[PDB]
């Protein structure tokens, strides 16, 4: 039912428009390169000739852009068109940028919903997909039925920075795990094991943790001893030690703070302060 | 059938002996702290009075000790008793320590199999369980049927360091992921989200990667947002700074337009 505007037609934007159209919503789109909207228009989307026209077309404006700089580049020249709009900003950036953007939007008469999309574009419109949302609750409830078409809409609270925080937490785990995976493939190669032979093992190894968390001795000292073996293994192999050294540094600080006999979770205390 | 010796009766050693006994094997045991064998002896294990006696009891000697320092502490005073033995060393340590130990064992007439046990003690003897093995293939094949009583036995190659490498690879991913998890809980708290409220999300966030299993420049931009988020929050930045340093080095190598996997080159 509710028609909607989507600005930004990279891969994420494309998926969102297609999903909106699949479900019977009229969609007005805009992008810097018009040929990216061709197929979408052929499917029933309407290409606005300017950003102003995109904004005027609908109350609900969904932004799928690379970062807040891209958002401001598009919106700063058209702030006179923002009055009475609801910006569902699904672009990645920091909690503090989200907070600033919410304030700025309100200066120009618009409401701001922060969205942190948890999935890549091919999972938009699929049942198990979800997006973190934060911002004014009354505004969220008013557009929730439209936002749910893209993903489950998981409202996390009033502050504009909250959805961004959850997203950046997700990306902390994702990128760190990704590097540890690559680190292992490097270590393998330095020991004469090809990446393709080690690949299935490294892949399975990434399931240990979610399994561990689902279920769970518990002495920091034992962890520290294992981590030291990890560090020396990478040192001995001649590969980069940036990542395992950082892990060791963190365990070291816990040990130096008298946590040897405490639970692993005491590391949360270590990480709370620089 | 095959009788076996187990040296080291911490929680892992205990499980191994119990599992061997459950399956009808005669087991001879030894430990630095002799009282830890009480329960096993009460089930039929034979406590050797000396390390020499433990070694002379059997061809196959399974070691479950804290590390190689412990292994040497026990075996160095009895190097004369090692001739004709097969040491299945399941003590976790580095690949280079495993290599050095294989050479040393061979100097004293013993064969050395490196074992990297992938599971905690209660999974010993159970179907889900596996152990990485490396060392001489003929020796492995000769004792594989005994070793399979403990876990599936996954032979990875001749080099003594290999099984240890696979184990340390597993622990690289485990500990690193674990710290990223704690890092998020720290970040949550600094933003007024309690660890208990964030806990189920942080847990589901650890599945992102294996599910998920592009352009380096886009990854670098996301990682910079991660770094600044933790900086802004006032929490530790040691871990996200290290992730950023790695992405930075890739960008500085001219890999912006390459796939993420180009990071393997950066890490080599
Ligand atoms: N527990 C687990 O979940 C897993 C463990 N591993 C690995 O298995 C091995 C054994 O672990 P686990 O049984 O859990 O307990 P530990 O890692 O604490 O090992 C304890 C054993 O090592 C002995 N030991 C320690 N230092 C010395 C020394 N200087 N001289 C002689 N003996 C020594 C202990 O003797 P005493 O009893 O007299 O102190 C005991 O028999 C470790 O290498 C570990 O990393 C691998 C996979 C899973």
Please tell me the distance from the alpha carbon of residue A97 to that of residue A134, in angstroms, as a whole number.
13
User: From the CB of B146, is ligand 1 less than 6 Å away?
Assistant: no
- Say how many CA atoms lie within 13 Å of A215 toward its Cβ: 5
- In sequence order, which ranges of chain B are alpha helices (DSSP H)? 11-22, 38-42, 51-56, 68-75, 95-107, 137-147, 161-190, 195-205, 208-212, 216-233, 238-252, 263-267
Report whether B63 contacts B8 (CB < 8 A): yes
Ligand 1 centre distance from Cα of residue A180 (Å): 26
Closest CA to A234 of B121, B96, B223, B208: B96
B66 is in an annotated binding site: yes
Task: Round to whole Å and give the CA distance between A102 and A98.
Answer: 6
Please state how this structure was obtained.
Answer: X-ray
Query: Residue A169 has which token pair?
Result: 């937490």
Resolution (A): 1.9
Residue B233: other Cβ atoms inside 10 A: 22
Q: Do B210 and A206 touch (CB under 8 A)?
A: yes
**Cα–Cα distances in angstroms (integers) from residue B239 to residues A97, A196, B175, in the given order:** 22, 28, 12
How far apart, in Å, are the Cα atoms of A28 and each of A87, A110, B139?
A: 14, 19, 70
Find the B152 Cα to ligand 1 centroid distance in Å: 21
Q: Is B74 in the pocket of ligand 1 (CB under 6 A)?
A: yes
**Contact present, A265 and B198 (Cβ < 8 Å):** no
First vs last Cα of chain B: how many Å apart? 46
Alpha-carbon span A188 to A174, nearest angstrom:
21
Q: Is B88 in the pocket of ligand 1 (CB under 6 A)?
A: no
C-beta of residue A124 within 8 angstroms of C-beta of residue A19 = yes
Buried b (16+ CB within 10 A) or exposed e, A75-91: beeeeebbeebbbbbbb
Q: What whole-number distance in Å separates Cα of residue A45 and Cα of residue A23?
A: 12
A180 and B168 within 8 Å at the Cβ level: the answer is: no
Q: Atom 3 (ligand 1): residue with closest C-alpha?
A: B120
Gap between the Cα atoms of A150 and A126, Å rounded = 8
For a mutational test of ligand 1's pocket, the pick from B65, B67, B76, B128, i.e. the residue with the most ligand atoms closer than 8 A to its C-beta, is B65
Q: What's B214's DSSP letter?
A: -
The b/e string for A183-215 (b: 16+ C-beta within 10 A; e otherwise) is bbbbbbbbbebeeeebbebbeebbebbbebbee
- What are the C-alpha distances in Å from B59 to residues A25, A55, B6, B81, B257? 75, 81, 11, 11, 57
Distance CA B116, CA A20 (A): 51
Report the alpha-carbon angle A191-B139-B19, nearest 5: 95
Q: State the Cα–Cα distance between residues A22 and B17, nearest whole angstrom.
A: 61
CA distance A260 to B250: 36
CA of B116 to the centre of ligand 1 (A): 13
Size of chain B, expressed as the number of residues it contains:
268
Q: Which of B129, B131, B208, B200 is nearest to B164 (CA)?
A: B131
Count Cβ atoms below 10 Å from residue A107 Cβ, excluding itself: 10
C-alpha A201/C-alpha B213 separation (Å) is 12
Q: Any long-range contacts for A68-75 (C-beta under 8 Å, 24+ apart)?
A: A68/A93, A68/A97, A68/A98, A68/A101, A70/A8, A71/A101, A74/A7, A75/A51
Q: Which atom of ligand 1 is nearest to the CA of B9?
A: 41
Domains and CATH numbers, chain B: 1-158 (3.40.50.720), 159-268 (1.10.1040.10)
The structure tokens listed for B262 are 């180009």
Longest dimension (CA), chain A: 65
Q: Is B254 annotated as a binding residue?
A: no
Query: For residues B27 and B46, is the Cβ–Cβ distance under 8 A?
Result: yes
Residue A209 has its nearest CB partner, among B169, B177, B229, at: B177
Alpha helices in chain A, H assignment, sequence order: 11-22, 38-42, 51-57, 68-75, 95-107, 137-147, 161-190, 195-205, 208-215, 220-237, 242-256, 267-271
Q: How far apart are CA B162 and CA A192, in angstroms?
A: 9
Q: Are strands A27-30 and A46-47 parallel, antiparallel or unpaired?
A: parallel
- Three-state DSSP class for B129? coil
Q: Is B216 annotated as a binding residue?
A: no
CA distance B238 to B230: 10
DSSP secondary structure string for all residues of B144-204: HHHHTTTSEEEE--SSTHHHHHHHHHHHHHHHHHHHHHHHHHHHHHHTT--HHHHHHHHHH
Tokens standing for A124? 């938009």
Helix (H) or strand (E) holding B48: none
Longest distance between any two alpha carbons in chain B, whole Å: 66
Distance from A71 to chain B by nearest Cα, in Å?
15
Which residue lies with its CA nearest to atom 2 of ligand 1? B120
> What is the whole-number distance in angstroms between the Cα of residue B89 and the centre of ligand 1?
12
**Whether B225 and A168 lie within 8 Å, measured CB to CB:** yes
Pairing of strands B27-30, B86-89: unpaired
Tokens of B12: 């892992």
* Distance (Å) from the alpha carbon of A87 to chain B's nearest alpha carbon: 21
Contact A229 B182 (CB under 8 A): no
């Amino acid at each position: 039912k509710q028609s909607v505007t989507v600005i930004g037609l990279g891969p994420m934007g494309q998926a969102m428009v297609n999903t909106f159209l699949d479900n019977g919503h009229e969609v007005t789109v805009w992008n810097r390169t018009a040929s990216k909207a061709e197929a979408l228009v052929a499917r029933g989307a309407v290409l606005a000739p300017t950003v102003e026209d995109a904004l005027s077309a609908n109350e609900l404006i969904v932004l799928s852009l690379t970062d807040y700089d891209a958002v401001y580049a598009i919106l700063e020249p058209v702030t006179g068109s923002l009055s009475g709009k609801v910006i569902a900003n699904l672009s990645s950036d920091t909690p503090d940028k989200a907070r600033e953007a919410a304030k700025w939007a309100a200066k120009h008469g618009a409401k701001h919903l922060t969205g942190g999309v948890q999935v890549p574009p091919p999972l938009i419109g699929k049942p198990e997909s979800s997006t973190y949302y934060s911002g004014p609750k009354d505004v969220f409830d008013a557009h929730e039925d439209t936002l749910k078409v893209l993903t489950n809409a998981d409202y996390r609270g009033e502050d504009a920075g909250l959805a961004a925080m959850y997203y950046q937490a997700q990306m902390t785990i994702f990128w760190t795990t990704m590097l540890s995976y690559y680190q292992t493939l490097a270590l393998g190669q330095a020991n004469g094991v090809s990446a393709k032979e080690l690949l299935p093992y490294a892949t399975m190894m990434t399931s240990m943790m979610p399994h561990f968390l689902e279920l769970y001795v518990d002495r920091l000292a034992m962890g520290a001893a294992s981590v030291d073996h990890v560090l020396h293994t990478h040192q001995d192999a001649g590969v980069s030690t940036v990542l395992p050294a950082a892990v060791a540094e963190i365990f070291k600080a816990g040990m130096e703070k008298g946590f040897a006999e405490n639970s692993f979770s005491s590391l949360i205390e270590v990480l709370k302060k620089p």
